[PDB]
Ligand binder design. Structure first.
Ligand SMILES: [Mg+2]
Ligand SMILES: [Mg+2]
Ligand SMILES: [Mg+2]
Ligand SMILES: [Mg+2]
Length: 760
DNA sequence: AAACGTACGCAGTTCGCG
DNA sequence: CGCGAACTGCGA
């Protein structure tokens, strides 16, 4: 099983290293024969001799063209003749490529910015994560001592915990009486002991939660101060910090650092993504969170450290359990895309599409298009196109509603109508499909590049869905549900890739053709279910819609819905399929992209509501959730009105605990780059003036106090809140937090928003 | 050296124009 | 004052 690939430079020459795990043994295979290259298109072949003489320089090394070779390939399906230029070192390509393109006889260059290790995996047809090999795993987490106004890693690490199949243990340099706690003398001995544990265990995978941005960077800075060689790699190397665009990632040579945070972020939809919320969402059991303030107080006073050690232990144990379930899912995606697990687990949907396209293009001798230059990139940003059809929702609290949607609308359209840049307006074709409204033609004589690959993706999702319904184990049912959803967003990401300004296979014509077909098919289905089956579509968004039959039983609606699915699916062509996704006894639709429904099991599912959004206090989210229950479950508008009255009265009389009034908002940039100052920016700017380090990603937890001025003038960081000297703004939390979310709900159901709050 | 898939949306805060 | 625009953050 190929784990990963990289390259090292040995005497000025690159050596490909293939990290593998075969027969329970970790092995490194060395390849010194692979040569870097890129392509160049010439006006006349006679100029290849002058192109060969082009040189460049790279930190003291003269770069020359090692060897050239003319090859016949295809560009967007059309035959093309290009020159393959070979070089000694992969870093020769960045140094010389601009000078080669600048030659007047060179029309353009291609495939000049593909990493050397990834190029090796593609050109050798090597697929990582293939086979039934078992990878050894070890999760770990750290607990630190923090104070406001300090620099990163200024305080020491207090505990290092780790967990595998043998259990979880904690290393610390203070005496904590717990059987899973090993006590050393100093922070240095604690770090060195953890380094020994990893070396003796020798795990293939190191599991963390947000280790890319916290745990590894913290251990690194501490090791520099204490003068510790943090040799976590199997080659003895230290963890290397890389920069994937605007985010940081940490690799450990010889192993795979599996950071669960970017995996869970894309796999599960949650309001917050703390480790505690993630563990409960997957396993159903709660996990206690111990904050940095309690950790600092327990360590410094010396009292209550057993609770900190248990929290640190649970961190490693929970991270291992989560890593056990999600590694096989991400391992399959690595097999599907053909990219290492380390990159796949953190890669964006766009790069996951492009890397698979790059591999398939090589297999088909298709020359890859380039990433756009600066002019073309900004040109693509300035152009857009129409998207999905969103109907203005009908007002009211409705009963006996079915939800019908397409199985995979955009991928189904791409395959059915052969939407591909190599098929767009292709001359001399014997059959083509014309997109409505936008009029783009797409050849149907041969399978397009992208349509020929989307079919296998949709097949993999249907196999996962088949095992999903058959599985009875509730856990395994949930992971497979997560897994097939990841395939859906990947296949759906092929459409968005057509409109991604940085995409190699950029095709705005392909993108708007997909959405135009999507708008036509959803509007056709809405028209047919209303005119032929007497339904009334209440709300529709892109690929699905909600609709009941006015004054019909639950059974009458279910039977007529299945009757319509038979009629409409016989009419719909190709791979397009409308599905029966659910029946809901009650439901209402506030605005576009905002709704709430309840099934026959009293399970409430919502979309775009304030309960799942950041920036609303808990007293507002909890009140909306209770109003949701009174309307959907009990059909009791008066009860929902009484709930809001009881809440606003408790707020006016200062009987609500201030912890439920905390608003959380994230700082997204450098504080100097904010053009407007809101409540969370004003609190951040005030904290930064006191020495607090505010960075992009810092979550501001503030509470609005009773006072004067704007809301930002009255807001203060909640850690500075003292209930003995501060009085929270009861009028603000009534009028601005609690009322608006429920006011819009009661208006949308057909009821006045008047007299919802308590008044004297 | 890589680099957020897309369009379609809502809604809070601030603040100036008419 | 009322409204809307700008800014801001994020949810098929
Ligand atoms: Mg790598
Ligand atoms: Mg952690
Ligand atoms: Mg654009
Ligand atoms: Mg059909």
């Amino acid at each position: 099983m190929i784990l990963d690939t990289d390259y090292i430079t040995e005497d000025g020459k690159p050596v490909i290293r293939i990290f593998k795990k075969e027969n329970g043994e970790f092995k490194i295979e060395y390849d010194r024969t692979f040569e870097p290259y890129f392509y160049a298109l010439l006006k006349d072949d006679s100029a290849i001799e002058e192109v060969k003489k082009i040189t460049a320089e790279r930190h003291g090394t003269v770069v020359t063209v090692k060897r050239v070779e003319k090859v016949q390939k295809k560009f967007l399906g059309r035959p093309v003749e290009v020159w393959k230029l070979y070089f000694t070192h992969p870093q020769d390509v960045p140094a010389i490529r601009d000078r080669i393109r600048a030659h007047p006889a060179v029309v353009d260059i291609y495939e000049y910015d593909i990493p050397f290790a990834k190029r090796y995996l593609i050109d050798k047809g090597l697929i990582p994560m293939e086979g039934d090999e078992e990878l050894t795993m070890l999760a770990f987490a750290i607990a630190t001592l923090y104070h406001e106004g300090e620099e990163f890693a200024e305080g020491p690490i207090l505990m290092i915990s780790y967990a595998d199949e043998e259990g979880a243990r904690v290393i610390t340099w203070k005496n904590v009486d717990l059987p899973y706690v090993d006590v050393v003398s100093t922070e240095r001995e604690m770090i060195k002991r953890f380094l020994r544990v990893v070396k003796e265990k020798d795990p293939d995978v190191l599991i963390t939660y947000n280790g890319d941005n916290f745990d590894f960077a913290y251990l690194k800075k501490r090791c520099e101060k204490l003068g510790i060689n943090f040799a976590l790699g199997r080659d003895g190397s230290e963890p290397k910090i890389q920069r994937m665009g605007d985010r940081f990632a940490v690799e450990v040579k010889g192993r795979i650092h599996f950071d669960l945070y970017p995996v869970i972020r894309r796999t599960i939809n949650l309001p917050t993504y703390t480790l505690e919320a993630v563990y409960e969402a997957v396993f159903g059991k709660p996990k206690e969170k111990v904050y940095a303030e309690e950790i600092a107080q327990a360590w410094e006073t010396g009292e209550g450290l057993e609770r900190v050690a248990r929290y640190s232990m649970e961190d490693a144990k929970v991270t291992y359990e989560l890593g056990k379930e999600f590694l096989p899912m991400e391992a399959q995606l690595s097999r599907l895309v053909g990219h290492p697990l380390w990159d796949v687990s953190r890669s964006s949907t766009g790069n996951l599409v492009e890397w698979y396209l790059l591999r398939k293009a090589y297999e088909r001798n298709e020359l890859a298009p380039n990433k756009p230059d600066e002019r073309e990139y900004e040109r693509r940003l300035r152009e857009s196109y129409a998207g999905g059809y969103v109907k203005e929702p009908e007002k009211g609290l409705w009963e006996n509603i079915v939800y019908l949607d397409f199985r995979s609308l955009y991928p189904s359209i791409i395959i059915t109508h052969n939407v591909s840049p190599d098929t767009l307006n292709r001359e001399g074709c014997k059959e083509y499909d014309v997109a409505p409204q936008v009029g783009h033609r797409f050849c149907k004589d041969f399978p397009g590049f992208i349509p020929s690959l989307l079919g296998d993706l949709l097949e993999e999702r249907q196999k996962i869905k088949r095992k999903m319904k058959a599985t009875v184990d509730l856990l395994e049912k949930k992971l497979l549900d997560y897994r097939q959803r990841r395939i859906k967003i990947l296949a759906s990401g092929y459409y968005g890739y057509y409109g991604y300004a940085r995409a190699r296979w950029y095709c705005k014509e392909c993108a708007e053709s997909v959405t135009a077909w999507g708008r036509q098919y959803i509007e056709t289905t809405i028209r047919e279910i209303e005119e032929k089956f007497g339904f009334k579509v209440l709300y529709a968004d892109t690929d699905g819609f909600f609709a009941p039959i006015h004054g019909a039983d639950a059974e009458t609606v279910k039977k007529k819905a299945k009757e319509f699915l038979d009629y409409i699916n016989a009419k719909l062509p190709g791979l397009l399929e409308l599905e029966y996704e659910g029946f809901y006894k009650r439901g209402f639709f506030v605005t576009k992209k905002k709704y709430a429904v309840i099934d026959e099991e009293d399970k409430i599912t919502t979309g775009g509501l304030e309960i799942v959004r950041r920036g609303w206090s808990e007293i507002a989210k909890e009140t909306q959730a209770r109003v949701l229950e009174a309307l959907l479950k009990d059909g009791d508008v008066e009860k929902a009105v009484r709930i809001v009255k009881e809440v606003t009265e408790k707020l006016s009389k200062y009987e609500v605990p201030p912890e439920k009034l905390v608003i959380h908002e994230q700082i997204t940039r450098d504080l100097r780059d904010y053009k407007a100052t809101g409540p969370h920016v004003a609190v951040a700017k005030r904290l930064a003036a006191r020495g607090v380090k505010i960075r992009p990603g810092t979550v501001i937890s503030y509470i609005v106090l009773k006072g004067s001025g704007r809301i930002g003038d009255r807001a203060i960081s909640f850690d500075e809140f003292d209930p003995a000297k501060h009085k929270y703004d009861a009028e603000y939390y009534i009028e601005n937090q609690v009322l608006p979310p429920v006011e819009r709900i009661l208006r949308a159901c057909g009821y006045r928003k008047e007299d919802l709050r308590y008044q004297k």
